[PDB]
Design a protein around this ligand. Sequence first.
Ligand code: GDP
Ligand code: 9PC
Ligand code: CA
Length: 304
Amino acid sequence: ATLKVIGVGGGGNNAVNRMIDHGMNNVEFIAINTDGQALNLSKAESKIQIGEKLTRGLGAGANPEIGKKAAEESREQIEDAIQGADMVFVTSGMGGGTGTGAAPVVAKIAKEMGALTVGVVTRPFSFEGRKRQTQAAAGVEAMKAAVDTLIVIPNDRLLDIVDKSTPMMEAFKEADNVLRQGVQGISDLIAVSGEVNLDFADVKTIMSNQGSALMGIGVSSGENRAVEAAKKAISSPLLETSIVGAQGVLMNITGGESLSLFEAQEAADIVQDAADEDVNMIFGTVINPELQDEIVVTVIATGF
Ligand SMILES: Nc1nc2c(ncn2[C@@H]2O[C@H](COP(=O)(O)OP(=O)(O)O)[C@@H](O)[C@H]2O)c(=O)[nH]1
Ligand SMILES: NC(=O)c1c(F)ccc(OCc2nc3cc(Cl)cnc3s2)c1F
Ligand SMILES: [Ca+2]
């Protein structure tokens, strides 16, 4: 199963750069921008410049109709870079000319290519103004209508998690983690055969043609570890779509040899509970004798 991550527009291309610096193996990156200046600064291996005729190497100047046309224009170019993919992650910052327009086109194409297509998009800060927020909203709606599942990260949520001196770039990589853990998480699942095994078909079942989505992970050790880790995996300080309301959950617990049946029920009860719905769950377990005392709990919840 081939996963590609594609950032669209400046923010999404900054996400691709920081993820890459982090080192993400077996995932192919694709940078898409109208602004050739930034694109040339990408560490993405596969680089597509969109709307060259339209913008002449510049960005879309806040006009999503430019970014939309620009991606339509280079449609074939995007199709090729996508080609061979089983699952694609389209990541972008809503509210600009390029992401708000092109990203939903890019996501459309991916789906048409038969790829499981997931978007991780930001909503703009309230301080950016009312107009940029309305434009982003339209983009989010377009995203929803082009994807299999969507995660929305309101940039305003970052204000919840910083003190007055936390640098902006440090607030940003906090947001990076949502997508990054999502991708690495789904990558391990595929890679390893667990003792209660989940695979890409289980991923497809839970994420295809859904709507909103939650992706999360929690780590704990100590005595309430399972319940602790499970709480963290559905914790949503930066999330717009909360766990509550969820019809479907794919869930996995990784621990060492000491993983007990009892603590696994504790963790699952927590999730099924917090949804406070009749969750159709797909459960999995991994035993990594390396892990010893740590417990990892991972969630993909949809069906709202
Ligand atoms: N969280 C986050 N948001 C960003 C980042 N860069 C840009 N944005 C947001 O995305 C919106 C669009 O900006 P950008 O993606 O650079 O413009 P575009 O290239 O024309 O799509 C802005 O209003 C910002 O809220 C980033 O690095 N992190
Ligand atoms: N039982 C299995 O087949 C298996 C495995 F052998 C290794 C890892 C697994 O889960 C890894 C994940 N990590 C994450 C992170 C987020 Cl943010 C969301 N969902 C997931 S799923 C599994 F489900
Ligand atoms: Ca597996």
